Paper text:
In the crystal structure of the PDZ1/APC-C11 complex, six complexes can be found in each asymmetric unit. Interestingly, in addition to these canonical associations, there are more interactions observed between PDZ1 and APC-C11 in our crystal structure. The β2/β3 loop seems to facilitate the binding of APC by forming interactions with residues upstream of the canonical S/T-X-V PDZ-binding motif. In addition, the carbonyl oxygen of Leu2839 forms a hydrogen bond with the side chain of Asn244 at the β2/β3 loop, which is conserved in PDZ2.
The human Discs Large 1/Synapse Associated Protein 97 (here referred to as DLG1) protein is a member of the membrane-associated guanylate kinase (MAGUK) family, a protein family that has been identified at sites of cell-cell contacts in different organisms including humans. The human tumor suppressor Adenomatous Polyposis Coli (APC) is a 2,843-residue protein. In addition, we determined the crystal structure of the PDZ1 domain in complex with the C-terminal 11 residues of APC (APC-C11) as well as the crystal structure of the PDZ2 domain in complex with APC-C11.
Numbering used by the authors:
A (entry chain G): 2837 to 2843
B (entry chain A): 220 to 309
Write the structure that this text describes.
Amino acid sequence: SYLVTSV
Amino acid sequence: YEYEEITLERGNSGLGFSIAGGTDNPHIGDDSSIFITKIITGGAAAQDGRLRVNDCILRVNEVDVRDVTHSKAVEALKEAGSIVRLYVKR
């Protein structure tokens, strides 16, 4: 899960 | 698998959760789906109380997100407005 964007 | 619907109102600091996944993101298996990694204390999602870490979002309002890149699912969640229907699988 290299890229984790907070929404 | 369980299938759940969760409606959220957008808060000042957004929906109150984080997503990993997407077709362009590393993962174990055939499983490239968008999923919850964190739910923020006192955020919209935690206040609603239904959403859990590891949830797979299949759909955001009327926009399908089951076969998209990480960026398409981020944009869909950002562009979805003040009231958001999350169709998840746990």
